[PDB]
Design an enzyme around this catalytic site. Structure first.
Site, mmCIF file in Angstrom:
data_model
loop_
_atom_site.group_PDB
_atom_site.id
_atom_site.type_symbol
_atom_site.label_atom_id
_atom_site.label_comp_id
_atom_site.label_asym_id
_atom_site.label_seq_id
_atom_site.Cartn_x
_atom_site.Cartn_y
_atom_site.Cartn_z
ATOM 1 N N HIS A 200 0.802 -1.222 0.000
ATOM 2 C CA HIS A 200 0.000 0.000 0.000
ATOM 3 C C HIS A 200 0.838 1.276 0.000
ATOM 4 C CE1 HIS A 200 -3.303 2.713 1.532
ATOM 5 N NE2 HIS A 200 -3.988 1.949 0.703
ATOM 6 N N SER A 204 0.808 -0.759 -7.135
ATOM 7 C CA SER A 204 1.227 -1.896 -7.937
ATOM 8 C C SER A 204 2.176 -1.513 -9.062
ATOM 9 C CB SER A 204 0.023 -2.615 -8.542
ATOM 10 O OG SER A 204 -0.961 -2.882 -7.577
ATOM 11 N N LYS A 226 -13.604 -7.426 -11.948
ATOM 12 C CA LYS A 226 -12.686 -8.300 -12.652
ATOM 13 C C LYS A 226 -12.147 -9.395 -11.743
ATOM 14 C CE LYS A 226 -8.680 -8.001 -15.505
ATOM 15 N NZ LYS A 226 -7.775 -7.258 -16.414
HETATM 16 C C1 HEM Z 1 -0.515 -16.995 0.979
HETATM 17 C C2 HEM Z 1 0.311 -16.298 0.203
HETATM 18 C C3 HEM Z 1 0.058 -14.944 -0.514
HETATM 19 C C4 HEM Z 1 -1.020 -14.126 -0.578
HETATM 20 C C5 HEM Z 1 -2.426 -14.258 0.053
HETATM 21 C C6 HEM Z 1 -0.674 -13.004 -1.406
HETATM 22 C C7 HEM Z 1 -1.494 -11.936 -1.723
HETATM 23 C C8 HEM Z 1 -1.204 -10.887 -2.566
HETATM 24 C C9 HEM Z 1 -2.117 -9.903 -3.093
HETATM 25 C C10 HEM Z 1 -3.636 -9.830 -2.811
HETATM 26 C C11 HEM Z 1 -1.420 -9.070 -3.866
HETATM 27 C C12 HEM Z 1 -1.983 -7.861 -4.650
HETATM 28 C C13 HEM Z 1 -2.596 -8.278 -5.987
HETATM 29 C C14 HEM Z 1 -1.701 -8.936 -6.991
HETATM 30 O O1 HEM Z 1 -0.792 -8.280 -7.533
HETATM 31 O O2 HEM Z 1 -1.917 -10.121 -7.290
HETATM 32 C C15 HEM Z 1 -0.040 -9.483 -3.855
HETATM 33 C C16 HEM Z 1 1.014 -8.888 -4.513
HETATM 34 C C17 HEM Z 1 2.334 -9.276 -4.481
HETATM 35 N N1 HEM Z 1 2.827 -10.424 -3.901
HETATM 36 FE FE1 HEM Z 1 1.713 -11.822 -2.851
HETATM 37 N N2 HEM Z 1 0.631 -13.175 -1.812
HETATM 38 C C18 HEM Z 1 1.110 -14.350 -1.289
HETATM 39 C C19 HEM Z 1 2.375 -14.868 -1.480
HETATM 40 C C20 HEM Z 1 3.437 -14.251 -2.105
HETATM 41 C C21 HEM Z 1 4.717 -14.825 -2.440
HETATM 42 C C22 HEM Z 1 5.062 -16.297 -2.124
HETATM 43 C C23 HEM Z 1 5.460 -13.884 -3.063
HETATM 44 C C24 HEM Z 1 6.912 -13.899 -3.621
HETATM 45 C C25 HEM Z 1 7.935 -14.658 -3.235
HETATM 46 C C26 HEM Z 1 4.666 -12.684 -3.116
HETATM 47 C C27 HEM Z 1 5.038 -11.466 -3.656
HETATM 48 C C28 HEM Z 1 4.191 -10.462 -4.089
HETATM 49 C C29 HEM Z 1 4.559 -9.274 -4.816
HETATM 50 C C30 HEM Z 1 6.007 -8.920 -5.233
HETATM 51 C C31 HEM Z 1 3.442 -8.562 -5.052
HETATM 52 C C32 HEM Z 1 3.309 -7.212 -5.806
HETATM 53 C C33 HEM Z 1 3.295 -7.488 -7.298
HETATM 54 C C34 HEM Z 1 3.010 -6.333 -8.207
HETATM 55 O O3 HEM Z 1 2.291 -5.390 -7.835
HETATM 56 O O4 HEM Z 1 3.494 -6.374 -9.349
HETATM 57 N N3 HEM Z 1 3.448 -12.954 -2.535
HETATM 58 N N4 HEM Z 1 0.048 -10.594 -3.055
HETATM 59 C C1 LIG Z 2 -13.305 -9.329 -5.153
HETATM 60 C C2 LIG Z 2 -12.199 -8.637 -4.361
HETATM 61 C C3 LIG Z 2 -12.508 -7.971 -3.181
HETATM 62 C C4 LIG Z 2 -11.503 -7.349 -2.470
HETATM 63 C C5 LIG Z 2 -11.865 -6.629 -1.180
HETATM 64 C C6 LIG Z 2 -10.164 -7.395 -2.929
HETATM 65 N N1 LIG Z 2 -9.068 -6.815 -2.295
HETATM 66 C C7 LIG Z 2 -7.891 -6.978 -2.888
HETATM 67 S S1 LIG Z 2 -6.303 -6.328 -2.302
HETATM 68 C C8 LIG Z 2 -6.249 -4.559 -2.728
HETATM 69 C C9 LIG Z 2 -4.877 -3.885 -2.586
HETATM 70 C C10 LIG Z 2 -4.509 -3.407 -1.321
HETATM 71 C C11 LIG Z 2 -5.416 -3.571 -0.106
HETATM 72 C C12 LIG Z 2 -3.300 -2.767 -1.112
HETATM 73 C C13 LIG Z 2 -2.433 -2.591 -2.162
HETATM 74 C C14 LIG Z 2 -2.788 -3.049 -3.417
HETATM 75 C C15 LIG Z 2 -3.987 -3.697 -3.658
HETATM 76 N N2 LIG Z 2 -4.139 -4.075 -5.061
HETATM 77 N N3 LIG Z 2 -3.802 -3.241 -6.069
HETATM 78 N N4 LIG Z 2 -3.993 -3.816 -7.238
HETATM 79 N N5 LIG Z 2 -4.446 -5.056 -7.013
HETATM 80 C C16 LIG Z 2 -4.798 -6.036 -8.022
HETATM 81 C C17 LIG Z 2 -4.530 -5.225 -5.669
HETATM 82 O O1 LIG Z 2 -4.912 -6.213 -5.155
HETATM 83 S S2 LIG Z 2 -8.163 -7.887 -4.293
HETATM 84 C C18 LIG Z 2 -9.859 -8.065 -4.096
HETATM 85 C C19 LIG Z 2 -10.878 -8.686 -4.809
#
Ligand code: HEM
Ligand SMILES: Cc1cc(C)c2nc(SCc3c(C)cccc3-n3nnn(C)c3=O)sc2c1
Ligand SMILES: CCCCCCCCCCCCCCCCCC(=O)OC[C@H](COP(=O)([O-])OCC(O)COP(=O)([O-])OC[C@@H](COC(=O)CCCCCCCCCCCCCCCCC)OC(=O)CCCCCCCCCCCCCCCCC)OC(=O)CCCCCCCCCCCCCCCCC
Ligand SMILES: CCCCCCCC/C=C\CCCCCCCC(=O)OC[C@H](COP(=O)(O)OCCN)OC(=O)CCCCCCC/C=C\CCCCCCCC
Ligand SMILES: CCCCCCCC/C=C\CCCCCCCC(=O)OC[C@H](COP(=O)(O)OCCN)OC(=O)CCCCCCC/C=C\CCCCCCCC
Ligand code: HEM
Ligand SMILES: Cc1cc(C)c2nc(SCc3c(C)cccc3-n3nnn(C)c3=O)sc2c1
Lengths: 378, 49, 62, 106, 49, 71, 51
Positions: A200, A204, A226
């Protein structure tokens, strides 16, 4: 006034999910973060149902699992949701890590280092749960790890007769395996909240690698709709497996109860541990085997300082993209070799592909990025 | 023509012209916090009535 | 300029914004009246003379 | 620094320029650089007209990528008309950071 | 104390919201009749048995 | 990081249309087919040749495990 | 690299190896108290903690 901006609870929800600025060109490779959060909640609720009817005792462990599939109402659907939901977790997790590696997301240093910790904690959780049904792979999977865990030089044999309750396998043996396996998914949840708190601070990354403050859109409604759509498409694929092929990914040998006296024809773990198992059996030593297994997850934390390119992502780097999919086609080779028996063709192929996994990350990738800098005159 | 107007007439003519319609919008200057068109169009209805 | 029959419900009920959120409740009727003449009847037709309630007559009475 | 086979190496530099594809989004080479703390100081030192040209080229390429499209081929950036507008400002920012660092150890 | 709700034109505001509020009492008469399958008002209409 | 505090921008204009003024499918299979034939032609030579190497090793590997047995 | 090399980097390391072995030896003697490390429990036999 606007109650979305002045209420103490609604402010936090609005800053995190509603009014959050997000890039406009985010792909569906960015869907798998919320898919991982859906897979974690699913494993928690389903696992809390199975834990009211399971018995951790090596005389009645296998029999309490057959009882829920036959006697308890809706126990067969909830058990095969749990076993197949764990394969769903590990396939989304490997897509997620490969995304952040191709697009250079490891430059968010605090977000990347909490992620490498989360990768260890889910791999250890899934190991403990596969011991609990106590069939002939829960047995010969537990002993292969814990005689490899007696090759720690000074405290090794102290730690092997702690996890069995003091002993060999008895009634108090799987109380510690069960209590670790209960507790670790709730620590994974706390580490994933801190994970998003550090993201945050920057927002991204995007597929171009270039910063996009001039092109933000609000998170609602564009990525709330989406992400709902991608979650429904994931619940479809999971139920195709539960209702039309619930035994496709497992092994038949785990339907025989554990017997130290009988013999299993082969030793094959789950598909998502088969790549690590192939690196183990290529080292003729038992201290150098457990070292090279732990160094294959811990090499991810060196990716920020091995970066020598002028650009952030691989979209405009065509030679770095040939090396990225040489590395994916090398983890497919190590998954196949890990499920084969140990004879002549599969013994040299297995160790020439354990060398290539470390040669690409440590040597060939940082040299190729410097050649690309020089062909663009920086 | 002004003496005929009461509160139920005003309530009827405003729903005909404002409620659930697409507006036209123009903006100039430091306008980064001008809301998205989807968020403006959703402000043209109340989920109660 | 004769249009097609789109605006059945744009004016009366789905304008007030309420049956828009109420047709998850009011609009939850009579499709478990209808889509049972689907899945159930297609299921017993693909498997004809293979289920228990097909063959249970000749074991029944006495 | 070869003198006879720098015609061979001029062709490899052209091949790599086309195989990379920022020219198909209408970008210049200095538009694609990774912004560390060093590059962020060179950006704020640019004159107003060069800063405004860079913000529009990036916004337009980010809009093409949202739609999975590229520009018509008559609007692709050519190899000989790519202006390295950011490179003299970046060399000076780096040269000043080396001087604060040699002063702190001696 | 609650004569804040007592004005000559405040009870005018009940006259324009009770036609919307005349109806969602009949959603409970139709929505968990759906959900929990109450056999009381399945006796009612010859569509359903 | 909120909306009116992100960057500085001058002299760019945006034109947009309402969603209720538009068709849902202007072109679906008359631009959807030739645009994915452009995006496939750009990726194939970077992605496919590593997986043609896994195929030739799988085929040779499961052919020196059969002939080890029965002469 | 040479961004960290100089006469000033290991300057403050030579000032901090006394703050280092104290980083290490305390954690090394902290590792016996936690998990009842019984092959270094009677390293000095004056701790008869196990009854
Ligand atoms: C239970 C495991 C995990 C959960 C629930 C989780 C969840 C998330 C979510 C919701 C985001 C934001 C949306 C997205 O870009 O897809 C994110 C971003 C990210 N995660 Fe994870 N993650 C997990 C594991 C990991 C692991 C294993 C790695 C790397 C070794 C990782 C590295 C990152 C990075 C670098 C981002 C930012 C990517 C970008 O904005 O380009 N995460 N994660
Ligand atoms: C359906 C549904 C509902 C909820 C409530 C939800 N919440 C997330 S986490 C949002 C977020 C946070 C909190 C902080 C920094 C970055 C992002 N973020 N920015 N881009 N993307 C793809 C991200 O996940 S996914 C998702 C999907
Ligand atoms: C639900 C919520 C989930 C929480 C439940 C538990 C989950 C575990 C957890 O929270 O993990 C967070 C974990 C530790 O949790 P925590 O200790 O409870 O809280 C953080 C503290 O602020 C810890 O201090 P810090 O992380 O802010 O320190 C900053 C940095 C620099 O700090 C210093 O050098 C010392 C300066 C004074 C710091 C003292 C502040 C006052 C106390 O750290 C150091 O290098 C040395 C720190 C001092 C020694 C550490 C032992 C004492 C603590 O923090 C991180 O993961 C940091 C990630 C950064 C990694 C470095 C990558 C970039 C390079
Ligand atoms: C959306 C992007 C799709 C692009 C074109 C689609 C046409 C159909 C063919 C598919 C092509 C394809 O998948 O690869 C090409 C396509 C090109 O995309 P750009 O971001 O535009 O790169 C530009 C470079 N020219 O590449 C990608 O999509 C890259 C994908 C990112 C990485 C993949 C995510 C996860 C992949 C594998 C996971 C395995 C790794 C395991 C890691 C775990 C740790 C041990
Ligand atoms: C995701 C699911 C979204 C699908 C349907 C959208 C639902 C909400 C719209 C209902 C309100 C419409 C009229 C109200 C007037 C108005 O402008 O409201 C402002 C304001 C902001 O949203 P809108 O602009 O309405 O959304 C549509 C924008 N095109 O109203 C709200 O909706 C308040 C915000 C609360 C709703 C949350 C967003 C919808 C669902 C949430 C899923 C995840 C988002 C955050 C998490 C919420 C719970 C963890
Ligand atoms: C990230 C979360 C989790 C993962 C990856 C995971 C994984 C697994 C796996 C692979 C098995 C073996 C099942 C089989 O193949 O037959 C298992 C079993 C089991 N798990 Fe989980 N689990 C998770 C969370 C939980 C939680 C939170 C609980 C309890 C509160 C739980 C309770 C159980 C129980 C009781 C069994 C009993 C044996 C069986 O039902 O087969 N799990 N788990
Ligand atoms: C970080 C980490 C930790 C652990 C502990 C770990 N362990 C393995 S391999 C275990 C195994 C064997 C050797 C044989 C049969 C079955 C299983 N096995 N056990 N659980 N599951 C899901 C299995 O497939 S990699 C790995 C990585």
């Amino acid at each position: 006034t606007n109650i979305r901006k002045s209420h103490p609870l609604m402010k936090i929800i609005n800053n995190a999910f509603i009014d959050l600025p997000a890039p406009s060109n985010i792909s569906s490779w960015w869907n798998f973060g919320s898919l991982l959060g859906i897979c974690l909640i699913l494993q928690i609720l389903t696992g809390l149902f199975l834990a009211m009817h399971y018995t951790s005792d090596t005389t009645t462990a296998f029999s309490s699992v057959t009882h829920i599939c036959r006697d308890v109402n809706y126990g067969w659907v909830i058990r095969y949701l749990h076993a197949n939901g764990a394969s769903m977790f590990f396939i989304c997790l490997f897509i997620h890590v490969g995304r952040g590696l191709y697009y250079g997301s490891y430059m968010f240093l605090e977000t990347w280092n909490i992620g490498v910790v989360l990768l260890f904690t889910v791999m250890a959780t899934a190991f403990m749960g596969y011991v609990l049904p106590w069939g002939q792979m829960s047995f010969w999977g537990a002993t292969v790890i814990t005689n490899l865990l007696s090759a720690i030089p000074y405290i090794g044999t102290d730690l092997v007769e702690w996890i069995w309750g003091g002993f060999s396998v008895d009634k108090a043996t799987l109380t510690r395996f069960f209590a670790f396996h209960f507790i670790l998914p709730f620590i994974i949840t706390a580490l994933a909240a801190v994970h998003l708190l550090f993201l945050h601070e920057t927002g991204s990354n995007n597929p171009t690698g270039i910063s996009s403050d001039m092109d933000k859109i609000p998170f609602h409604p564009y990525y709330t709709i989406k992400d709902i759509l991608g979650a429904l498409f994931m619940m479809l694929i999971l139920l195709i497996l539960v209702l039309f092929s619930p035994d496709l990914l497992g092994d038949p040998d785990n339907y025989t109860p554990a017997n130290p006296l009988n013999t299993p024809p082969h030793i094959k773990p789950e598909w998502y541990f088969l790549f690590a198992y192939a690196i183990l059996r290529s080292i003729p030593n038992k201290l150098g085997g457990v070292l090279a297994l732990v160094a294959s997850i811990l090499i991810l934390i060196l990716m920020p300082m091995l970066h020598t390119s002028k650009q952030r992502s691989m979209m405009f780097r065509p030679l770095s993209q040939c090396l990225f999919w040489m590395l994916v086609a090398d983890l497919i080779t190590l998954t196949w070799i890990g499920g084969q028996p140990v004879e002549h063709p599969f013994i040299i192929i297995g160790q020439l592909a354990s060398i290539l996994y470390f040669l690409i990350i440590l040597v060939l990738m940082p040299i190729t990025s410097i050649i690309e800098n020089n062909l663009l005159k920086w | 023509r002004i003496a005929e107007v009461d509160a139920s007439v005003v309530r009827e003519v405003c729903s005909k012209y404002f409620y659930d319609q697409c507006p036209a919008v123009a903006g100039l200057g430091p306008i980064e916090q001008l809301p998205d068109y989807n968020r403006i169009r959703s402000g043209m209805f109340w989920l109660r009535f | 300029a004769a249009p097609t029959l789109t605006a059945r419900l744009y004016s009366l009920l789905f304008r007030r914004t309420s049956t828009f959120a109420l047709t998850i409740a009011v609009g939850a009727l009579f499709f478990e009246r209808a889509f049972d003449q689907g899945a159930d009847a297609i299921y017993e037709h693909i498997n004809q003379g293979k289920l228990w309630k097909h063959i249970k007559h000749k074991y029944e009475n006495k | 620094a070869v003198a006879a086979s720098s015609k061979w190496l001029e062709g490899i530099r052209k091949w790599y320029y086309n195989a990379a594809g920022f020219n198909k989004l209408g970008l210049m080479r200095d538009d694609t650089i990774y912004e560390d703390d060093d590059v962020k100081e060179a950006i704020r030192r640019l004159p107003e007209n060069l800063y405004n040209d860079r913000v529009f080229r990036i916004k337009r390429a980010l809009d093409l990528t949202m739609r999975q499209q590229i520009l018509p081929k008559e609007q692709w950036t050519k190899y000989e008309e790519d202006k390295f507008y950011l490179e003299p400002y970046l060399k000076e920012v780096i040269r000043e950071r080396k001087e604060r660092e040699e002063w702190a150890k001696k | 104390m609650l004569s804040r709700f007592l004005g000559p034109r405040y009870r005018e505001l009940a006259r324009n919201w009770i036609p919307t509020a005349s109806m969602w009492g009949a959603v409970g008469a139709v929505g968990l009749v759906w959900a929990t399958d109450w056999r009381l008002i399945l006796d009612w209409v010859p569509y359903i048995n | 990081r909120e909306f009116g505090h992100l960057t500085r921008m001058r002299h760019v204009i945006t034109y947009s249309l309402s969603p209720f003024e538009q068709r849902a499918f202007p072109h679906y299979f008359t631009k959807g087919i030739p645009n994915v034939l452009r995006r496939t032609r750009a990726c194939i030579l970077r992605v496919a040749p590593p997986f043609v190497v896994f195929y030739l090793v799988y085929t040779w590997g499961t052919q020196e495990f059969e002939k080890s047995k029965r002469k």
